[PDB]
């Protein structure tokens, strides 16, 4: 099987920038490659076929290049309707597959914004059920890359937490993230200090919001 | 009118069977390379099957022996018979007209297939109370935790829609229990937290559940 | 005592496209399979229905020499019971095929720096090819319900595509010259023997 490695995973660009996406096959596929555009909830849209041929109806600011293993998509002048996720495909019929790239998300570039951190202890109603869910909130930040580390009595917790990120806000171009740490009532009552540690580009040092169980 | 219309998707328990349909107009199915491409939630595109105009079919390794692509030339319809369904088959399934070296030009709107051993269950709504630690500076945050429901989706509003600015309803996460969990928070000025009452309205049509939960400061 | 013209097929300077494969009818001659035993390091010599060492001991009514050019990724289709764009729409071998298939990498011969678009292949066809069928039609393929009337555009595509053989391509996308030898033995006087 051919492996299509696409880079970068995400990039930030303002309107008018020259945007470049790279797609690499694990072996020579000559010119059998295509580029697609996809917006959330919509079907994919064909942009380039045969490595460098522009699909009918696609604006001329799009252009493909490369042959063999290294391919590049190029948007000469980024327009507002071009903020989306782009994929490359190996149209070669050997070995079947038609593998797609990992995808590149192109969001709106703006100034760096540090997140507002809020920690929420589990509700008394939920503790009555036997499950304790602690939620950490990262409000209105940029860029998307942000790291949340749970600490329980200063013990770094991993594997029992889940995260969710909203789409780039249509008004201030920021992201917001929630992280849910779930424990049984028994394990929750075994510890005292609950904190989430947020590191981000807009923070020179990690921010920690914490509480003590029962205060 | 050149378009592909998918149907047949839905909820089914693992091991069940499901047949997707792809009604075409403009493009002739029996004359084209027709392909099925699926996309799991938050993941990339994955090719599934293809049927040549000459009848040759080709399937991905993960669905070999389970899926069968077919077509009815009189109906001008493409079919995908999906047997022995698994959780990892949960994805939006597109039918498309493949042009090989000329790319894939015609895509359908997609039909949603969800494979889970979970039953329909209404969510528990818990308050995320705005405490002293939930106030960075000048504004505080409050929210609701919509936990343990199935299937998607739920809709959440605040004060019956009167509060819309600064509201963030996050996309749900699939828990190891197989039930979805979701949170919706809102940031307000700290001065209004005890002159304005905040109630989140959670609606879950699969279970006919409408729950209104008041979020109040926690009492020490 | 004429010798079978095998030199004219393998040592030909130009080969035909796969969709319009050339067939040389070889009959009433003395065949030397020892020069095709082991030509070079290329050992594409898969024989079906017949043994190579037994060819010198067998007489056939007619011997057909089919020659064409494909890519490396498609040689696996030139075999009995294969599927693909080449096998279904260009050159199909029967399920009971009796003969040998020969191929060798001709990247130093059929690939130019600017792309050798001379070699073509068929991309669109309404149905599959019968064994030993040659379709040289260039009619605009009607992929929709609207008739084409020889107008290339949407749902009306030219049924032939170019290979564009470049010498820097991958091995699988480099040109390969193929020679398929079919051995026929029907109710007729056998004239092609070995020695
Ligand atoms: C074809 O010619 C080459 C040299 O040009 C020679 O090595 C080879 O044996 C010839 N093959 C046949 C079948 O005559």
Numbering used by the authors:
A (entry chain L): 1 to 215
B (entry chain H): 1 to 220
C (entry chain E): 333 to 527
Task: Provide the publication's sentences verbatim.
S is the major surface glycoprotein on the SARS-CoV-2 virion and is involved in viral attachment to target cells via the interaction of cell-surface-expressed angiotensin-converting enzyme 2 (ACE2) with the receptor binding site, at the tip of the receptor binding domain (RBD), in the S1 fragment of S (Lan et al., 2020). Following attachment, cleavage of S releases S1, allowing a major conformational change in S2, exposing a hydrophobic loop that executes fusion of viral and host cell membranes, releasing the viral genome to initiate viral replication (Walls et al., 2017). In-depth structure-and-function analyses of 27 potent RBD-binding mAbs isolated from vaccinated volunteers following breakthrough Omicron-BA.1 infection reveals that they are focused in two main clusters within the RBD, with potent right-shoulder antibodies showing increased prevalence. In summary, we have presented a structure-function analysis of potent human antibodies induced by Omicron BA.1 breakthrough infection in SARS-CoV-2 vaccinated individuals.
Structural analysis revealed binding to be broadly similar to that observed previously for early pandemic virus (Dejnirattisai et al., 2021a), although the Fab was translated by several Å and formed looser interactions, consistent with almost complete loss of neutralization activity. S309 binds the right flank with H3 contacting G339 and the N343 glycan, which is close to the serine 371, 373, and 375 mutations. 371 is a Phe in BA.2 compared to a Leu in BA.1 and superposition of the structure of BA.1 in complex with S309 (McCallum et al., 2022) on our BA.2 structure (see below) shows that the bulky Phe protrudes outwards disturbing the glycan attached to residue 343 of the RBD.
